[PDB]
Design a protein around this ligand. Sequence first.
Ligand SMILES: *[C@@H]1O[C@H](CO)[C@@H](O[C@@H]2O[C@H](CO)[C@@H](O[C@@H]3O[C@H](CO)[C@@H](O)[C@H](O[C@H]4O[C@H](CO)[C@@H](O)[C@H](O)[C@@H]4O[C@@H]4O[C@H](CO)[C@@H](O)[C@H](O)[C@H]4NC(C)=O)[C@@H]3O)[C@H](O)[C@H]2NC(C)=O)[C@H](O)[C@H]1NC(C)=O
Ligand SMILES: *[C@@H]1O[C@H](CO[C@@H]2O[C@@H](C)[C@@H](O)[C@@H](O)[C@@H]2O)[C@@H](O[C@@H]2O[C@H](CO)[C@@H](O[C@@H]3O[C@H](CO)[C@@H](O)[C@H](O)[C@@H]3O)[C@H](O)[C@H]2NC(C)=O)[C@H](O)[C@H]1NC(C)=O
Lengths: 48, 439, 53
Amino acid sequence: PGQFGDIQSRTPESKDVYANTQLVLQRPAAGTVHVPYSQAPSGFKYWL
Amino acid sequence: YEHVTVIPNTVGVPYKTLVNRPGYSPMVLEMELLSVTLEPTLSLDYITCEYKTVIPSPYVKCCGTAECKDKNLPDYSCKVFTGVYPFMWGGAYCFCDAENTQLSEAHVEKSESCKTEFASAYRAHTASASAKLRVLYQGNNITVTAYANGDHAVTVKDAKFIVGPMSSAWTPFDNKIVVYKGDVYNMDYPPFGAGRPGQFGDIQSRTPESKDVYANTQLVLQRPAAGTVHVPYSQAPSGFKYWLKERGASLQHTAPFGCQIATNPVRAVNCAVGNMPISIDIPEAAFTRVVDAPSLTDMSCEVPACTHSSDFGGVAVIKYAASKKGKCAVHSMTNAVTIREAEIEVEGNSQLQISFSTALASAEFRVQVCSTQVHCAAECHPPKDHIVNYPASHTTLGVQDISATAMSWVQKITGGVGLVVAVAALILIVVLCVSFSRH
Amino acid sequence: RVPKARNPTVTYGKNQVIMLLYPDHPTLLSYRNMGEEPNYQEEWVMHKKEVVL
Ligand SMILES: *[C@@H]1O[C@H](CO)[C@@H](O[C@@H]2O[C@H](CO)[C@@H](O[C@@H]3O[C@H](CO)[C@@H](O)[C@H](O[C@H]4O[C@H](CO)[C@@H](O)[C@H](O)[C@@H]4O[C@@H]4O[C@H](CO)[C@@H](O)[C@H](O)[C@H]4NC(C)=O)[C@@H]3O)[C@H](O)[C@H]2NC(C)=O)[C@H](O)[C@H]1NC(C)=O
Ligand SMILES: *[C@@H]1O[C@H](CO[C@@H]2O[C@@H](C)[C@@H](O)[C@@H](O)[C@@H]2O)[C@@H](O[C@@H]2O[C@H](CO)[C@@H](O[C@@H]3O[C@H](CO)[C@@H](O)[C@H](O)[C@@H]3O)[C@H](O)[C@H]2NC(C)=O)[C@H](O)[C@H]1NC(C)=O
């Protein structure tokens, strides 16, 4: 996660996607309907 | 029956003690400190908060000279400037072309935001410790909360607990404390009436409602600009805001021994320093005669696996023959091995499994179950996981209960060197005896 | 209301913790020993950073 290669695929048009982004769902805040999560940002952008 | 024990101050780690009353079935009590709270006695000296500089309107007196009388306000100053020609939006203030004077006066007083935004300077003298304890009494989980000065006794299940006093007087607070909202800082604040401009304590007051204000801000009036009626002044900015912008890390993040810090009231929580004595009074009714409790014989111990990790990495299996079905206490006979189980259910001829933790490379210990002792021995292997999130359940190894079963190398080398030394000493003794006999 | 930073990516080594941190905004990272001498240390992280403690 967070590095080059966090999401990978054999070819751009392929539907086989491997993703290891450390996606953990978090408890929503009281009185709200949002869906919070703690996810490592895109490793491709950080590489860029 | 009165029992005296000592447990380390570590929070969240259970410790087991053996209530051994001969002629009665032994009991094992598991006590765990949920929280140790140190609440010091605080004496307030003063509170520091943002000041406000009250500047009345300037007094422009033309064809005349103004004078000001010295007043006793906390930091009060008057200045009369000559040759001023103030202007309004319409025109010049008055006909008088020269010799006009402007009296400008200013003083300093506590801002009303002092009702809410302030930092108190306390003196800390002594700490009154309290403790919350989880006790495994006869298979039941009971929670008590009691002062840890050795004075408060708490009764649960007809059993009396006296907790403390703590063996160490260490506290994360030194003599002078600064409390802002929830952050406690350990700072040598200046004494009242000795504050300095542009720093913590420039403006002070004994109580938040006290009208006595000590202000030292170097408030100096300056000549107004030509053709303007403003009142300029040179003053060191508020020391409280300055302190806020460079507070640094509060004790909540830098206290030694991993203390947590809370305010309102100021408390130091879960300081793992020293240890804690506990005295326990158990009724004679709670004990059980040995003839009634199960007795175990033909008892043998074998350890299939041992891993000296922080968790309970070792497992032991004990073959036993129980005279009758019932519950029985299990306890360790050594301080280097900690047993997770407190009591087991036994019946007939069978085997029982216990979990234990240790730091020894070679685990050689003894286990007491219903006053029957079994000697367990095993070779333990190190774990592969480097870091864990929980404190070690076993005690550290010291200088006596040390080394592994492969210490026989030390014995062999010591024996060989001692044999060489003995041969040399024997030769020397023979030669000396020959020389002494010869004359 | 103040936010909570993302969960750091944690790896372990011999007496070492290696944390990879992804802050959205300048985030304060501090650490201390829990023994006799805390040896408190702190630093502000403005960008993604790997710290060995
Ligand atoms: C926003 O929120 C903050 C905090 O939540 C509020 O601040 C609180 O305001 C309260 C109202 O004043 C404070 O309560 C009292 O304030 C007294 C002001 O004079 C203060 O003196 C009191 O403290 C004394 O009593 C305590 C009782 O346990 C003692 O522990 C303490 O040491 C003080 O003891 C005095 O010591 C001197 C020293 O010799 C003696 O001469 C006195 O005789 C002693 N008095 C007593 C009774 O023993 C008491 O705290 C409250 O403290 C304060 N909060 C904090 C953290 O300080 C704001 O008001 C709130 N904003 C708004 C708008 O409401
Ligand atoms: C007496 O209390 C101890 C300590 O637990 C404390 O008291 C309990 C009443 C609960 O309030 C706990 O939240 C509290 O910390 C008990 O030992 C603990 O029991 C719990 C559950 O009984 C164990 O949790 C389980 O652990 C396994 C293994 O990891 C998980 O798979 C489970 O999902 C669950 O989380 C915990 O490990 C255990 N701890 C120890 C050190 O033994 C004890 O059971 C209890 N006894 C009685 C008779 O009430």
